[PDB]
Amino acid sequence: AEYQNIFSQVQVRGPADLGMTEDVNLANRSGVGPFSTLLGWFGNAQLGPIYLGSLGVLSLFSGLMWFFTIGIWFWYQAGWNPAVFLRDLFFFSLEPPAPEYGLSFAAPLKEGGLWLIASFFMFVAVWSWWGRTYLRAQALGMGKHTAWAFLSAIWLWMVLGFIRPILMGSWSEAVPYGIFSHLDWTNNFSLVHGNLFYNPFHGLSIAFLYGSALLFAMHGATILAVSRFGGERELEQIADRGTAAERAALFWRWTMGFNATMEGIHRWAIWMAVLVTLTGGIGILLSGTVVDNWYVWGQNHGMAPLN
Amino acid sequence: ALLSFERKYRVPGGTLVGGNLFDFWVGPFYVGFFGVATFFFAALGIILIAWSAVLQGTWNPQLISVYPPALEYGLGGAPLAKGGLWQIITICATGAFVSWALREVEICRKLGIGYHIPFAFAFAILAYLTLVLFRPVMMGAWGYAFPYGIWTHLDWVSNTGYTYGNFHYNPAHMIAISFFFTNALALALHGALVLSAANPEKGKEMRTPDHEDTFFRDLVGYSIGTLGIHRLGLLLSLSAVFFSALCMIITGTIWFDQWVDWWQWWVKLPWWANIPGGING
Amino acid sequence: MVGVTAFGNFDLASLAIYSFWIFLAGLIYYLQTENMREGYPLENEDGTPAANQGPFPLPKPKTFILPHGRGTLTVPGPESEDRPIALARTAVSEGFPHAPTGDPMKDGVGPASWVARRDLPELDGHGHNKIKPMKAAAGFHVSAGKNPIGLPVRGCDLEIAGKVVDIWVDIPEQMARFLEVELKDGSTRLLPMQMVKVQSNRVHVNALSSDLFAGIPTIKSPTEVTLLEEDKICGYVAGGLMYAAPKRKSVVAAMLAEYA
Ligand code: BCL
Ligand code: BCL
Ligand code: BCL
Ligand SMILES: CC[C@H]1c2cc3[nH]c4c(c3C)C(=O)[C@H](C(=O)OC)c4c3nc(cc4[nH]c(cc(n2)[C@@H]1C)c(C(C)=O)c4C)[C@@H](C)[C@@H]3CCC(=O)OC/C=C(\C)CCC[C@H](C)CCC[C@H](C)CCCC(C)C
Ligand SMILES: CC[C@H]1c2cc3[nH]c4c(c3C)C(=O)[C@H](C(=O)OC)c4c3nc(cc4[nH]c(cc(n2)[C@@H]1C)c(C(C)=O)c4C)[C@@H](C)[C@@H]3CCC(=O)OC/C=C(\C)CCC[C@H](C)CCC[C@H](C)CCCC(C)C
Ligand SMILES: COC(C)(C)C/C=C/C(C)=C/C=C/C(C)=C/C=C/C(C)=C/C=C\C=C(C)\C=C\C=C(/C)CC/C=C(\C)CCC=C(C)C
Ligand SMILES: CCCCCCCCCCCC[N+](C)(C)[O-]
Ligand SMILES: CCCCCCCCCCCC[N+](C)(C)[O-]
Ligand SMILES: CCCCCCCCCCCC[N+](C)(C)[O-]
Ligand SMILES: CCCCCCCCCCCC[N+](C)(C)[O-]
Ligand SMILES: CCCCCCCCCCCC[N+](C)(C)[O-]
Ligand SMILES: CCCCCCCCCCCC[N+](C)(C)[O-]
Ligand SMILES: [Fe+3]
């Protein structure tokens, strides 16, 4: 059997890597974490350092508060009983205000108010985390592609929890915090809008979700296949094309008639992934606000403009 | 026409069948024995689909739909207009996909690269076969397979899913989904990271993999590294599909009731089954 | 009893999807032309511009600023191999293979190919050589797995070709990249890590028979390797899979099969 480069055969370690400085405030970086030999079979062995800073602390605090607001409500539903907590863990749910409260913050803590609080903390955690993806790239002199890609995930999240509820006129439209209950919410959303698979933006979102597994399987396999020529050193292959980048391009040219470059494959990548949630957010934003029933819509805009 | 760097790679050799008989290209496409086999299978398949369209009485691509034999046929043959075309088309599809993977293998051997790509593709083919072959065989009828139609195959997923209640409750489905979502996340981050390094702020020099590691350590306290990320993308996408095939092969065979009820096993553990309070007491 | 949508706002959604397909056609055009920054214009087999370039035009050039005074890269730009290609036509028309005119391993063609990359080492973010023999990498040591240093190295003919004398490591990524193997004459070669199997008693190299080790391209300085030298080394080693097949399939067939 030939070696396949799925796991490393030999690990090496050197002095802890404190990373590039550039314009980073080094006062806000932790020390390095431990080294994990386990992780080192597959990826890097080193943990940390991590960048703390004020936004970081804010984001973590806010995120933990979201998590604890849900978890505290769960304990309450468990009657403070640890065994009931674990038994029914997936069944508890922190639900939004009932329709009657509309968009007001007037609902009682136990009947929506607590959901609003948890949501508020989630809003701050996510947006401040977004700031952090921008700021960490900026400090290093890098492009802002991560922040732009993250914004696409944020779009579906905002649509689900904030924009669609506001446009529908009530917090009751939003998603509950629970394992099984968010799943029931999803099933129900589709039933009530006449079957989401008639929503063209849902079918697109799924083409991109599958395409995104198709594409990462293609790319990850290609890079490993040419790692014997240093193919995973992608930045240098971009600056100075090597036999790795040529054999990768020609595998695909010979297979399917066209190919990418070492840089441009990463653009197919970024867009295949971001379009999942871009088209997704649109498809659900339209659901209920402008289209009540996708089956009915499809009977009028799919068979009727075939004219 | 050739890429500018292409000629030096177009040497003889690497074929698995036929020696040099099919060792050539058509424009950019390599042929090989398996290029001929793919062409044959794909052509026959498409012709039979066109014939099924005629028997169905439509040429609209949004209406054409080829169905497997009704359940009464079990695992036997069926008349062509009644499931037989589906069966032949399925054999053609399978021949075409497997030929495609083996043509990829010939291309790997000519290029002196690893076999990771057709290995990965073979996962997709195994998911396809789970649905049209492995699962119907285990359940005792071709009629449990999906039909070949753009919208009809979606009716099949809806109908199949709803047979077991909210299919969300299938635990192998939950895992498959987590791998799909996690794969898309990682593909976004990978694309974004390489691009953000290769295309830095205006007038700055290209960043290095040192900066890519630094960015991820700053951000979340860990960077998997440039080899690791491609290992990961491959693992996440193959795992997603492995758990997809698993989630279906167990459905209608070892588990055939409402998936939500499967979870009672956890709720009903002796040491807490009877404690009151919570959702299930 | 309030709702102002029925008369023509399911139009919106129709508008949205129509817009999306237009956007997507534009995106695919952008992506495909981005991916024509290397290898284009297409060429005939004799290196002249092909008549049919396809429906996509070359993108406007972009320039990468390289670190450490390495200059810039502008693409698309003039393409040339910048090396002799020792292959000849085997047919009178386009689309057939090109036969090596010499020894394809020595000539660097087919799966033994290399690219005329810059004859300088890749550098890390601090401007130091990315890859170094571990003996010269301060603080670096094997941290897990069998340490290959000192093991005999076996080729696909099952003969010993030399002994591992060091590991070349990627300093910023903390990974093993090559093994340095000392040959019978006392000189060394580099072997890509992806092309060796570290075993308890040996390192096995399926790609090369033992007699082909001396032909591995040598590096000009013993403590660094340039991007050009890595391409030549990796291309040659991978080329053995096709071109040493006579010396592999002869052995791993006389090794098994004995019963009848
Ligand atoms: C995977 C689990 C289910 C599945 C459930 C879903 C659901 C749910 C949806 C789809 C949708 C898609 N599915 Mg399906 N479908 C399955 C089986 C398949 C198979 C197969 C096994 O052979 C095929 C070819 C398709 C293909 C199709 C496309 C029509 C559409 C977009 C897919 C995509 O971009 O993927 C990603 C891959 C790429 C981006 C590469 C591009 C390949 C595509 C475009 C191939 C089209 C081929 C098609 C027209 C077949 C004609 C073949 C010719 C006769 C030769 N499905 C099984 C039964 N599929 C979506 C849709 O919009 O349907 C109306 C959708 O919402
Ligand atoms: C019965 C169920 C219904 C159905 C109803 C729904 C509904 C409802 C929705 C989808 C949506 C989607 N459906 Mg559907 N779906 C159906 C059947 C299918 C089938 C199938 C049958 O094979 C498939 C493949 C899909 C696939 C898809 C995806 C393409 C899409 C979600 C994209 C995504 O990445 O979301 C995952 C990504 C996110 C949710 C973004 C996350 C954002 C960030 C900000 C998260 C923050 C996390 C942080 C605060 C906490 C983390 C803690 C950490 C540990 C630190 N559906 C049927 C018809 N589907 C979604 C969509 O877009 O629809 C158009 C959606 O709203
Ligand atoms: C109401 C419907 C039910 C549903 C019931 C089902 C059912 C039923 C199924 C799934 C399956 C899937 N569901 Mg579900 N599920 C639902 C809700 C969802 C939601 C959601 C957010 O709500 C999500 C994310 C998912 C996601 C999942 C995935 C795990 C899985 C589909 C991917 C896959 O199998 O790929 C695997 C990939 C393939 C099969 C593609 C193989 C194609 C290859 C070999 C070649 C084709 C190429 C050729 C024809 C190209 C033409 C040439 C051109 C030039 C391009 N489901 C709801 C609750 N789900 C399916 C599954 O697991 O299947 C195994 C499945 O059968
Ligand atoms: C655009 C397509 C896909 C996508 C993209 C995407 N997501 C993104 C990014 C992008 C590019 C970001 O850069 C950002 C990121 O930083 O990723 C690493 C992110 C992200 N996507 C995430 C989740 C996520 N994304 C989703 C998926 C998707 N994201 C889409 C498929 C999903 C799904 C599918 O439901 C999930 C759940 C996060 C991992 C991260 C956003 C992080 C965030 O906003 O954090 C706010 C909250 C906190 C800071 C803390 C939360 C509370 C925790 C329970 C506590 C953990 C802290 C603890 C103290 C540490 C424990 C360790 C100790 C032992 C030391
Ligand atoms: C395993 C991880 C993911 C994956 C990986 C993967 N797919 C792969 C590969 C890999 C690595 C390739 O090497 C190979 C490729 O060349 O990619 C460009 C491929 C490929 N994946 C493809 C499609 C595809 N992959 C899918 C998904 C996935 N592929 C997984 C999620 C899907 C989904 C999710 O629905 C589709 C649609 C092709 C683009 C390509 C294989 C092309 C091929 O086999 O061509 C030979 C055959 C033909 C040209 C046509 C055959 C025609 C048939 C005889 C008749 C059609 C019958 C069909 C069943 C009807 C379907 C009707 C539908 C409406 C249901
Ligand atoms: C061991 O016990 C302890 C207590 C210590 C810890 C355990 C706690 C546990 C068990 C926590 C459980 C967490 C779970 C199960 C959470 C599950 C979350 C899920 C599945 C969420 C799914 C969807 C979320 C969405 C779409 C939410 C979107 C939210 C927004 C978009 C924010 C919108 C903001 C609003 C409405 C507030 C308005 C405020 C203003 C004015 C900005
Ligand atoms: C995928 C997210 C993983 C979380 C990795 C958290 C690592 C943080 C290490 C910082 C701790 C260093 N230390 C011990 C000096 O404080
Ligand atoms: C990075 C861009 C790649 C583009 C891939 C496009 C796949 C299109 C799939 C067709 C979906 C049809 N439908 C029914 C949803 O409207
Ligand atoms: C949604 C995608 C549907 C598949 C479209 C087929 C594209 C294949 C690429 C064509 C082959 C390239 N070339 C040079 C021969 O034209
Ligand atoms: C067996 C499935 C039916 C195959 C039909 C051929 C696929 C063509 C793709 C549909 C094109 C629809 N469009 C854009 C013309 O409206
Ligand atoms: C950070 C990538 C690690 C993979 C984790 C992805 C989430 C899937 C969680 C389900 C795990 C189920 N499994 C494979 C342990 O059985
Ligand atoms: C979603 C898949 C869409 C990809 C197909 C579009 C590009 C294929 C055409 C490339 C043409 C190759 N050529 C002639 C320029 O060398
Ligand atoms: Fe990559």
Side-chain angles (χ1 to χ4, degrees):
Chain A
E2 191 132 13
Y3 175 60
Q4 302 302 143
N5 211 12
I6 311 294
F7 301 113
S8 298
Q9 305 175 82
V10 188
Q11 301 187 39
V12 297
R13 188 171 303 169
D17 196 325
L18 315 191
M20 298 301 303
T21 302
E22 304 294 340
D23 292 327
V24 174
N25 185 348
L26 301 195
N28 288 339
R29 267 179 197 166
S30 82
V32 293
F35 283 80
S36 167
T37 293
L38 182 73
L39 257 33
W41 293 110
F42 193 71
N44 280 333
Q46 177 179 314
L47 286 302
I50 186 163
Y51 189 90
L52 316 153
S54 297
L55 250 205
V57 162
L58 173 59
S59 209
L60 178 64
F61 165 78
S62 201
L64 287 178
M65 283 310 293
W66 165 75
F67 186 71
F68 292 143
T69 302
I70 314 310
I72 241 73
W73 175 253
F74 279 23
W75 277 102
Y76 175 77
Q77 288 195 127
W80 311 99
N81 195 324
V84 170
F85 182 82
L86 298 180
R87 183 190 74 203
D88 294 352
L89 192 54
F90 285 11
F91 297 84
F92 305 122
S93 177
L94 174 53
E95 300 278 329
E100 292 86 52
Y101 292 98
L103 296 165
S104 81
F105 304 133
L109 286 184
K110 283 173 186 195
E111 284 179 88
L114 218 36
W115 178 92
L116 285 165
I117 291 168
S119 295
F120 174 84
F121 286 130
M122 199 189 193
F123 188 90
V124 171
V126 168
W127 281 113
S128 62
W129 198 262
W130 181 79
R132 174 176 169 98
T133 62
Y134 192 98
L135 295 172
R136 299 299 93 231
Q138 183 182 251
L140 287 160
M142 294 167 90
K144 304 308 172 291
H145 298 76
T146 303
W148 302 144
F150 186 22
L151 197 65
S152 180
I154 285 169
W155 164 241
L156 176 58
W157 167 81
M158 285 286 286
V159 164
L160 288 158
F162 189 82
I163 307 161
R164 195 188 163 272
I166 291 170
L167 291 174
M168 294 297 289
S170 79
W171 299 122
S172 64
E173 295 288 341
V175 179
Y177 308 109
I179 303 300
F180 292 164
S181 64
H182 97 292
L183 269 20
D184 298 337
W185 184 93
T186 301
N187 176 230
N188 188 241
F189 190 100
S190 172
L191 297 172
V192 153
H193 302 278
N195 186 171
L196 231 43
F197 73 46
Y198 296 128
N199 182 340
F201 285 103
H202 185 261
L204 281 166
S205 188
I206 107 99
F208 294 121
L209 184 68
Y210 292 172
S212 149
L214 161 55
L215 185 50
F216 222 166
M218 285 170 59
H219 181 56
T222 299
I223 296 303
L224 297 185
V226 298
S227 64
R228 58 184 66 175
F229 313 103
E232 77 278 15
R233 292 151 65 190
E234 295 182 302
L235 293 174
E236 199 71 4
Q237 295 275 333
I238 288 170
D240 195 0
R241 187 185 78 236
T243 193
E246 301 189 345
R247 310 184 188 217
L250 293 172
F251 175 91
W252 292 108
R253 186 168 202 82
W254 299 355
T255 296
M256 54 178 193
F258 74 111
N259 58 268
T261 57
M262 195 67 80
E263 191 198 359
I265 194 47
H266 296 93
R267 306 202 172 261
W268 281 108
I270 202 28
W271 280 101
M272 183 67 86
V274 319
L275 282 168
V276 171
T277 48
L278 282 182
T279 55
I282 291 171
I284 94 99
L285 185 63
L286 293 163
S287 289
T289 59
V290 338
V291 173
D292 279 339
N293 188 314
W294 290 105
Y295 172 79
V296 165
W297 184 90
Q299 286 289 315
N300 298 295
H301 190 90
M303 280 278 96
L306 197 128
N307 205 336
Chain B
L2 271 60
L3 291 179
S4 71
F5 50 78
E6 176 172 355
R7 187 190 187 196
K8 60 179 179 305
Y9 297 103
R10 293 204 174 191
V11 295
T15 66
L16 290 167
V17 169
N20 55 218
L21 299 206
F22 306 101
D23 198 5
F24 56 80
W25 292 257
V26 175
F29 296 103
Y30 177 72
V31 178
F33 176 74
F34 297 104
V36 174
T38 315
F39 175 79
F40 163 76
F41 286 125
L44 182 56
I46 293 155
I47 292 166
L48 293 174
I49 291 165
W51 191 14
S52 181
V54 161
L55 305 186
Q56 187 180 164
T58 183
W59 282 119
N60 193 321
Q62 292 201 97
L63 299 174
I64 298 163
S65 178
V66 186
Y67 294 91
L71 302 171
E72 27 151 349
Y73 291 95
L75 292 165
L80 289 179
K82 282 164 177 293
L85 284 167
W86 183 94
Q87 294 180 305
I88 299 174
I89 292 164
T90 299
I91 294 164
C92 288
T94 307
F97 304 156
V98 167
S99 296
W100 193 265
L102 292 165
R103 172 173 171 263
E104 295 189 340
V105 173
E106 286 192 334
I107 289 171
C108 297
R109 290 152 67 76
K110 190 184 291 303
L111 292 165
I113 71 175
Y115 297 138
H116 305 63
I117 298 161
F119 180 84
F121 174 44
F123 282 65
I125 294 172
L126 290 173
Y128 169 75
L129 286 175
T130 295
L131 302 178
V132 300
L133 177 62
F134 301 145
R135 180 177 183 268
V137 161
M138 287 175 78
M139 295 179 70
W142 300 115
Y144 293 122
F146 65 98
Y148 302 146
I150 286 170
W151 295 105
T152 62
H153 80 123
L154 269 52
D155 291 345
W156 179 94
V157 354
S158 198
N159 291 165
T160 303
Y162 137 126
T163 296
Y164 311 90
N166 318 174
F167 214 72
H168 287 151
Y169 281 98
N170 178 337
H173 187 264
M174 289 175 174
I175 293 176
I177 290 180
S178 300
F179 280 117
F180 276 108
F181 288 172
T182 302
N183 179 261
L185 202 185
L187 185 64
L189 294 176
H190 179 59
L193 190 56
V194 172
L195 292 174
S196 72
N199 305 272
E201 283 180 337
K202 194 218 282 286
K204 299 205 163 272
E205 301 163 305
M206 287 177 77
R207 260 87 273 259
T208 57
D210 319 27
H211 295 81
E212 293 183 287
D213 280 338
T214 300
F215 174 82
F216 260 90
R217 290 169 181 158
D218 281 347
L219 182 67
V220 301
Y222 180 72
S223 177
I224 201 168
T226 62
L227 182 55
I229 187 69
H230 295 95
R231 283 162 167 180
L232 184 59
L234 181 52
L235 173 72
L236 297 172
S237 62
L238 296 193
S239 285
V241 166
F242 173 85
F243 281 100
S244 305
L246 185 58
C247 101
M248 291 305 289
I249 206 172
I250 73 183
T251 291
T253 59
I254 72 184
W255 180 271
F256 48 79
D257 296 301
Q258 297 290 289
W259 271 113
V260 59
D261 293 321
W262 179 85
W263 292 89
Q264 290 181 207
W265 84 263
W266 170 262
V267 184
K268 275 11 183 162
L269 291 162
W271 59 80
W272 57 40
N274 301 300
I275 314 192
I279 309 295
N280 300 313
Chain C
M1 293 181 181
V2 275
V4 182
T5 313
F7 15 86
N9 254 224
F10 306 92
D11 241 334
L12 187 76
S14 289
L15 180 65
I17 192 58
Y18 170 84
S19 300
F20 180 80
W21 288 109
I22 292 166
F23 159 87
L24 181 58
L27 181 67
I28 287 165
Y29 183 84
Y30 164 80
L31 292 165
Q32 181 47 37
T33 60
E34 283 302 312
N35 284 267
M36 291 166 68
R37 295 190 183 273
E38 302 263 2
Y40 287 77
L42 301 186
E43 298 180 5
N44 300 308
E45 303 179 351
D46 61 7
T48 58
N52 179 31
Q53 294 294 324
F56 299 95
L58 289 179
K60 287 159 152 64
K62 73 187 284 179
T63 297
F64 297 102
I65 308 319
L66 313 176
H68 317 301
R70 299 272 177 97
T72 61
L73 173 70
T74 299
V75 284
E79 287 282 358
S80 56
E81 297 293 87
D82 290 337
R83 46 159 303 199
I85 301 309
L87 293 186
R89 271 205 161 172
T90 62
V92 302
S93 51
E94 289 237 330
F96 290 83
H98 300 89
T101 52
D103 178 330
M105 300 281 279
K106 293 176 169 157
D107 289 344
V109 304
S113 297
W114 50 272
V115 175
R117 305 190 79 190
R118 200 136 177 206
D119 198 16
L120 293 167
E122 187 166 348
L123 296 181
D124 66 32
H126 286 89
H128 302 281
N129 286 357
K130 186 176 179 47
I131 305 177
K132 296 195 175 169
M134 191 169 69
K135 80 197 196 201
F140 277 82
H141 55 280
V142 170
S143 53
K146 169 72 164 177
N147 186 332
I149 303 172
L151 286 179
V153 176
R154 195 177 62 170
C156 66
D157 55 339
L158 308 183
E159 302 294 344
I160 297 312
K163 46 180 275 47
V164 185
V165 300
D166 209 355
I167 298 167
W168 287 48
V169 303
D170 190 312
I171 302 314
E173 300 188 59
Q174 306 210 4
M175 85 169 264
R177 289 249 177 241
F178 300 89
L179 299 186
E180 185 174 358
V181 176
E182 173 178 327
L183 305 181
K184 189 176 167 202
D185 67 6
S187 63
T188 76
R189 302 297 186 273
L190 305 181
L191 274 297
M193 206 57 209
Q194 310 81 6
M195 297 297 283
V196 310
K197 180 187 174 47
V198 178
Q199 306 189 284
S200 56
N201 50 165
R202 72 172 75 82
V203 177
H204 186 76
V205 186
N206 176 52
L208 299 175
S209 51
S210 55
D211 64 298
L212 296 179
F213 275 72
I216 301 159
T218 55
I219 60 179
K220 71 175 138 83
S221 310
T223 74
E224 72 177 29
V225 59
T226 70
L227 293 182
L228 177 59
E229 281 159 349
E230 299 191 53
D231 246 47
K232 287 181 176 170
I233 285 151
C234 297
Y236 180 93
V237 175
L241 294 169
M242 177 177 289
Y243 297 126
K247 317 142 182 281
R248 174 184 313 111
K249 294 151 80 170
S250 176
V251 172
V252 205
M255 206 255 185
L256 287 78
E258 61 161 309
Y259 266 100

